[PDB]
Design a protein around this motif. Structure first.
Motif, PDB file in Angstrom:
ATOM      1  N   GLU A 109       0.822  -1.209   0.000  1.00 24.57           N
ATOM      2  CA  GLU A 109       0.000   0.000   0.000  1.00 24.57           C
ATOM      3  C   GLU A 109       0.855   1.257   0.000  1.00 24.57           C
ATOM      4  OE1 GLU A 109      -3.845   0.544   0.366  1.00 24.57           O
ATOM      5  OE2 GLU A 109      -2.975  -0.703  -1.204  1.00 24.57           O
ATOM      6  N   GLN A 110       2.031   1.148   0.606  1.00 30.07           N
ATOM      7  CA  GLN A 110       2.962   2.261   0.744  1.00 30.07           C
ATOM      8  C   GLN A 110       3.689   2.521  -0.572  1.00 30.07           C
ATOM      9  OE1 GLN A 110       6.121   1.404   3.515  1.00 30.07           O
ATOM     10  NE2 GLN A 110       6.827   3.532   3.634  1.00 30.07           N
ATOM     11  N   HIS A 111       3.812   1.481  -1.399  1.00 29.10           N
ATOM     12  CA  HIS A 111       4.552   1.533  -2.661  1.00 29.10           C
ATOM     13  C   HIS A 111       3.687   1.134  -3.860  1.00 29.10           C
ATOM     14  CE1 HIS A 111       8.425   2.370  -0.857  1.00 29.10           C
ATOM     15  NE2 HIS A 111       8.257   1.375  -0.003  1.00 29.10           N
ATOM     16  N   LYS A 112       2.581   1.855  -4.046  1.00 30.56           N
ATOM     17  CA  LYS A 112       1.530   1.425  -4.977  1.00 30.56           C
ATOM     18  C   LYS A 112       1.946   1.224  -6.431  1.00 30.56           C
ATOM     19  CE  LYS A 112      -3.050   2.210  -3.071  1.00 30.56           C
ATOM     20  NZ  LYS A 112      -2.456   2.514  -1.737  1.00 30.56           N
ATOM     21  N   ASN A 113       2.831   2.077  -6.940  1.00 26.00           N
ATOM     22  CA  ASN A 113       3.195   2.008  -8.365  1.00 26.00           C
ATOM     23  C   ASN A 113       4.603   1.451  -8.693  1.00 26.00           C
ATOM     24  OD1 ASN A 113       4.885   4.236  -8.040  1.00 26.00           O
ATOM     25  ND2 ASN A 113       3.532   5.693  -9.101  1.00 26.00           N
ATOM     26  N   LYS A 114       5.181   0.744  -7.723  1.00 25.73           N
ATOM     27  CA  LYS A 114       6.437   0.006  -7.925  1.00 25.73           C
ATOM     28  C   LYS A 114       6.192  -1.493  -8.127  1.00 25.73           C
ATOM     29  CE  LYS A 114       9.477   3.409  -7.079  1.00 25.73           C
ATOM     30  NZ  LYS A 114      10.114   4.109  -8.223  1.00 25.73           N
TER      31      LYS A 114
END
Ligand SMILES: [Ca+2]
Ligand SMILES: [Zn+2]
Length: 110
Positions: free
Chosen positions: A22-27
């Motif tokens: 959730e913290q790194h949505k687009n990685k």
């Protein structure tokens, strides 16, 4: 000529992967499910570290005995197992200590 903004993170308890996703949505997220008592895991760990320097992805280490629910959720049955997660969903896995196949998987989905 360049360095990558890299991330290599070891998780501590169930819930941490979901939080990280959730913290790194687009990685692209690449998760190494390992065990403390697994020889092949220890051998590949420095290579996984080296890989994390080459790709703009989030590299994650998960001890299957510390995050039991997460291992169960991802159906881990051998170690190391590397899972690629894109947009929160599993897109591939590599079962076994093959750094070449892990890198191939990253190349495909990054
Ligand atoms: Ca290095
Ligand atoms: Zn981060």
């Amino acid at each position: 000529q360049l360095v990558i903004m890299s991330e290599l993170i070891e998780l501590k308890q169930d819930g941490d992967l979901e939080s990280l996703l959730e913290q790194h949505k687009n990685k692209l997220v690449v998760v190494d499910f390992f065990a403390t008592w697994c020889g092949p895991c220890k051998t590949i760990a420095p290579l996984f570290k080296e890989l994390s320097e080459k790709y703009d992805a989030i590299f994650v280490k998960v001890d299957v005995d510390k995050l039991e629910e997460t291992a169960r959720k991802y159906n881990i049955s051998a170690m190391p197992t590397f899972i690629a997660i894109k947009n929160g969903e599993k897109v591939g896995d590599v079962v076994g200590a093959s750094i070449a196949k892990v890198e191939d998987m990253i190349k495909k989905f990054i």
